[PDB]
Symmetry: D2
Subunit: 504 residues, 4 copies
């Protein structure tokens, strides 16, 4: 009943670690997360954002354990077992165990240019299977998760499904909502493809990786943690989180008949704050335009250095940074110290020298300069095509400016790149996550929940849940030529208006 | 050079008080503000909201002084004088000196039922004139505000105008915006009705009481202070405020030619957070439904007790609580103490006993039972392109629905006999139902060391809901309904059906889309 | 299982109110605590210290409930019952229900000059008996505290004893601890004078009002709350409190054999922070020298107004402020609004006019001028191994020194004519002048799943000063001395010379050693 | 007039960066500080203590600039120049630029076992001379710090002296205090060995590296920053810091006649909080006993791996981790990623495999176990105390082993005795507050004073320093409580038998 450890945490005060979760924390696979920054290169703009994936993972664990333990005590008819509490807890603890260095770059532009095979969710699942089948881990968890191969393997399957599964996405297939009760009961019964548990435990899928509306404990932890680290204020607070946890129940989904996590309708504004806070932290922190400029230098360095950096894998074979996802043991040797590996390399191949040049430009702040931005409604597109169209129209406009003002190709020779940021609440361009959250009325002590009225987002939210930012990165030389820089900024705005993305 | 006092403050750490602002703080008129709760009856739901008008006024002073002092150092060409800095600072310090007890009730339902003459802004102006003409204050301020009676009087006029004036409201009238630029200048030249300063100091009107967009330092202080006291998180933070103060300049308004306070365009999101935070604190804190129920009991007590409670005015005449606004001296004897004056009264007139009964209901938590609520778009109040009409129609439709429920379920009038009242709250961002304050804030581009712009029409479409205001409609019934949930649930069902049946709301859903 | 209310609190985030504690909160007697400032007149120096006794009492309740509920889950062999948990919780909630207005002045100088009979702990016990015997409260608590009159009466007796009892003070008497342990057990057996529970529940007496070492939840709450409201940093933090709650057990006292609350020995520094934080907040906040100056004006006003202010008691008899402690009903009409009652009085008796004059001096900041201070070891009060004697000797020596200064510098009696008063403050850790509270706290070793120990004599020697208490001696003169710094500086010099010349202090130095 | 950058900071909200301080921040030498943890291995106990030397250095800069700028505005008669403000600012920014990886281990046990040449203060001074003599830095600072070689070199000398100099230590030579005014004025005049400024600017030496009483802006920043990161509450708060900055003046030292930073006497409690907060964070955070256990594993790994890890220096020569302090360019390639260099090494030499074994024990939490501790007054004597306690414990365990017939089960137990110095700074006996000058009243030349001898008697324990003596055992004893209990009993009996502890 006493925790093995109580660990100081700056968001919650402390995190309690019960036996045998301590055995998962004290593995090389979990301790690796101390050497991955939660927010990647954001620290080059917000220097206090140097918090690790380790502290996020402990925080996320603490929330998943607290929420399932609260549900078990307030609704004994759910039949939540010690096994359900530990599986859901472990999924929360290990959801993030498979990030590479600078994960969003590693899985994004680096993976795209390199044809990389696996992304962090795939690697998480591989590392979870590796950790849970270690004999010194199985001997500690067997009394909770099962002594038989069948029982233990089902428990491990549930842990990986709580991360990877999307068991409610069928409910949004066209006309599922208008089907008769009969058809519906049968469809839900035969749609159930989860192996680790039956439909009677469907609500656990809302806790760890909530694909339906993004209201998972991972989200709640990183909003609070990343707000505190960045100093950017958000409406979702520690007190907001405690309000949700004091007003949470499992109810029947009126659309599927499955058990779902619901909140008291008096908390709808508190749930809306989760999506609004996500979009705010994306706009101000994670996709800050100077962070984006430095990401382009880091991706070039990783691509140029990638063949030369080698990691020993399972069978003593060496894997390059470009192939490390092909072997879990080699992958586990990678950290954010990849940056220092490049800087300290004694390899004199021209490509290594190019990678070192790019990293040294970051440290001297020799980065691209801002040549304008606008925000736009994703609907006015019908994002890569928008970027290509804006870049082509800007080039035409700069040619016309160059010839009309007789600048002898000074404008036509300017090097610039058009980039985009998706600034959303999660989910799709058009849907606020709050619209897809179930609520209950009254103070229950079986309850059927409801989704909000169509009026709620009309009265409280902008028409679209997502905006795109289109921005221009120029050669740093343009910093000393404001008259040229001003023409590129003018061209971006005219290209936006000429495509009907912006009104003048 | 050095402040006379440095006073601890929980929002900023400290407030610096330079000479001779200390002399205004140390007056009976300013010290009275210790005994007025900034958020009225909110403390009966949020018990930590017991902060005074005194701490808000010191905070608001500190921001006005910091902002004008920053502008004077950053933009010497503005010709900001010590007299402009002190007048703007004092207007910020004293803007709230004229509140009555439980101000929003005092100036709202109490004033309406009583036909009260003056509201807090009127009383502030009267008390400002009284403070600044005290011999012991004039002797301290004459060296800054003017050694001639005429000069001193002009400074006092400026202080009161920074609170009461609306010098930019002409810019929105007629089609002033479409007028030939030259005629615009002539109109602006002849519209200038401010006596205490010329149009070259127009930007000072943005600092204290900003009628054009509500972005004054009074608003910035209360959002931070009321958020911290309530525990309700908002996007406008102390760091947001410091960002605005590090990115503020005076620029020319492209629509009037007048000097205005502007912010860097990189801070547009930080400015939008002011209006969004105001609406959030109204929805969650100031117009909390249980606060509104207890306000109805407090107003009944004040109306019933009002004739019996007397305050000595100028020349020793007694004024009732219902007439105190007619004499500044009698008004200055009023505080939130009025609640204890009623409770402790030895008057046995039936009306005093009714006031005591109502206050004892608050203390025993004998308050109305919640019988449902909904939010609505103000536009849905009519079918053409009336909050009171919404309230009357909802109440009439609920009565009809409860009659049908009563007869269909054979409840022998137990539903039809339920007493309930329908109320509304206006939950807005500070201006009109349709306009986000951010649309009416001027910004600048680049890192200047001159002409501002208003946001594109796209900004509100991409970032804000269609309407800046929402209405909440809610039902209060007899407290006894707490012990009869089956009956209470029918009334809550009737409110939802009534909203839908009058086209005020569309229903809660069985699927997202 | 579910709380009736969850109430926002700025120290803990929230306080959970289980049924039927909500019924005690919603009484006129508990709601009165909204209108008593927790730190009295401190707000005239620290304007954010306007938090009420109501918020402190809810916080204190929340800690007592959490601690006893944690002990019941961690140590089922203690046989903690629902009745023990609710009695201890209620004692914590209501310990502070009996404070008067400006309690420390009311029970201190006002009571001394007036010969007042009862102090706040006496009134708390009277008000607790009144609340728990209300028919609408007994109907809610009878199912937990007892369905027979005898059982209910025993529960109410336990609630009052957890506040007033001192069951461990015998352990320090005589040479009790050198006694043969057999005789010790029989003495402890026959010393047990508590009626509401047996000695098997002795550990509950450490929770609410801890006379033995002051480590009660009331102390833990006010240190956190008063630190946050004042902005004065202390070592005892919210995280320190959670550390104690995660490392707390009931063990056997090795000196008495009674069950006592103990902490893990790894938390000894966290416990020492409680007494050190108390002394710091006394020195910096509660006994701030400008607060003490304004207290002298407030006590004079209360004494002068006291006969004229009347409160209706049981059977409709009127009690003056000087007699209100003689009738619980009359006492319950008093709040901090007594200050406004004086200010607004229409009585023209010269004594009422004197009270109004004193309160107007506070509002205009017409307070005494500081004319020096020093700190001293209480041991230096006599030459053998008398705060009043220190104060008399300092004042007499200063007078002689000022006479010599006046004649030597030919100031024609301008120094000799200065009016001043010498005062003292006791700045201690809560027990006696010589004992650090931590020395009297039991600890345990290891991670048990039984006999505690007191700290080694080395702990205090290595970590604490020799004395747990210091005295501050300070001088208050006429406010006019603010405008005559050359005279003021001579008086400050005289205080330092007077302290040195009486061997109360050694002088400020020209080199560290 | 406007800062070039305003950078978010979790302690102050923001740090303003004026031109041309931005040019020093945007160097590889300063950016390296992002990859050195301020608190070393503390994060293995307090996982939120992962803040870098970079954020501490920016904070320390911001305080030094604010304090000297405030003094310049409040006391124009000090003749503080733009050059004094920028030299003092830069010394504060760069004081910490020369730490190695896991600095306290690197300069402590690693250096002792390796005979390492230089410590971090020496390397700071080398790196400051390298940065300030870069042509693209000199071209930016020449207009403030001097266009002539002589002027520029004087300014660079002042920056390095504000870090290394101890110009007031002569004031504590026996009998200096009792000398006549004549002798004193002459002694102070001829003791002045600072080259970068004259004695009229002595007060600047109190700002950056305060060797007299430790009341420098470096100390004030790390107490606030490390308290916030650790979640360990202290009496020194951000509001305490603002109180000091609102009540600070330069006054004449009554003992030397030199100008010194002084605080209003109403702030004596607020100054005492600095030393008390330092001792608290040492006891609870920096010298946490589990941190110490993991330090012994990390030192062994660094010693075993040190010959194999190589860094390219100035002339393309390779320097081992054990020699990197011999070449500033090789030193600048070192970071906390040395831990990952060991873990990922393909070298199969037995010593490299031993280093990897030790680091993998840290990650699996296979660390020594606690076998007791006590606190002691240093006057009852630290290396000798550790050796005596270990020898007496060994004798006591032999007597226990034979008397209880345990056939050498006690005598075979492997354990190590360690010590921690838990102090307020300075010496075992002196509270820093006793050595701080204060002033009286509200001045607008003032002579300051030191506190009465009574102040520490009434407010502080008799000694300013305590020692903690503790035992680390083989992790096997975690499963042998009866054996572990005898070692704990032996430590206590050894303390009592040497009169360090009383019954
Ligand atoms: Mg441990
Ligand atoms: Mg003062
Ligand atoms: Mg309620
Ligand atoms: Mg920039």
């Amino acid at each position: 009943m006493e925790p093995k450890h109580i660990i100081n945490d700056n968001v919650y005060g402390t995190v309690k670690v019960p036996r045998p979760i301590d055995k998962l924390i004290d593995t090389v696979e979990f301790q690796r997360l101390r050497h991955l920054k939660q927010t990647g290169l954001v620290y080059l703009v917000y220097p206090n954002c140097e918090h690790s994936r380790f502290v996020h993972s402990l925080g996320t664990f603490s929330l998943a354990y607290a929420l399932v333990d609260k549900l078990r005590h307030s609704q004994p008819s759910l039949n939540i077992t010690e096994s359900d509490l530990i599986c859901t807890s472990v999924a929360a603890l290990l959801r993030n165990v498979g990030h590479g260095p600078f994960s969003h770059l590693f899985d994004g532009e680096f993976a795209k240019r390199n044809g990389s095979r696996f992304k962090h969710e795939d690697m998480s699942i591989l590392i979870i299977k590796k950790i849970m089948n270690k004999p010194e881990i199985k001997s500690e968890f067997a009394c909770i998760l099962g002594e038989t191969d069948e029982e233990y393997a089902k428990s491990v399957t549930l842990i990986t499904e709580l991360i990877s599964g999307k068991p409610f996405d069928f409910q949004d297939m066209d006309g599922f909502k208008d089907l008769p009760a009969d058809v519906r009961e049968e469809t839900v019964k035969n749609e159930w493809a989860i192996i680790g548990c039956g439909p009677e435990k469907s609500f656990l899928f809302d806790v760890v990786s909530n694909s339906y509306n993004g209201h998972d404990v991972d989200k709640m932890d990183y909003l609070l943690r990343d707000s505190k680290a960045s100093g950017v204020g958000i409406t979702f607070s520690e007190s907001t989180l405690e309000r949700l946890f004091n007003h949470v129940r499992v109810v029947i989904d009126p659309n599927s008949g499955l058990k779902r996590i619901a909140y008291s309708i008096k908390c709808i504004g508190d749930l809306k704050a989760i999506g609004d806070s996500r979009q705010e932290l994306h706009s101000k922190v994670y996709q800050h335009k100077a962070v984006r400029f430095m990401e382009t230098l880091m991706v070039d360095a990783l691509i140029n250095a990638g063949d030369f950096l080698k990691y020993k894998g399972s069978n003593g074979e060496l894997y390059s940074l470009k192939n490390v996802t092909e072997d879990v043991d080699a992958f586990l040797k990678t950290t954010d110290y990849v940056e220092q590996e490049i800087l300290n390399s004694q390899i004199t191949d021209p490509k290594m020298i190019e990678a070192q040049t790019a990293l040294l430009k970051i440290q001297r702040r020799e980065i691209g300069c801002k040549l304008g931005y606008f925000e736009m409604n994703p609907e006015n597109a019908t994002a890569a095509e928008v970027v290509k169209k804006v870049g082509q129209k800007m080039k035409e406009i700069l040619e016309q400016m160059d010839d009309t003002e007789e600048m002898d190709g000074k404008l036509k020779d300017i090097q610039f790149t058009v980039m985009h940021s998706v600034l959303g609440r999660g989910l799709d361009d058009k849907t606020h996550p709050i619209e897809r959250q179930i609520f209950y009325d009254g103070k229950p002590s079986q309850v059927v929940g409801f989704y909000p009225s169509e009026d709620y987002v009309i009265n409280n939210c902008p028409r679209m849940a997502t905006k795109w930012e289109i921005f221009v990165m120029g050669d740093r030389s343009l910093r000393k030529e404001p008259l040229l820089a001003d023409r590129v900024k003018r061209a971006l705005q005219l290209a936006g208006e000429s495509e009907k993305f912006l009104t003048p």
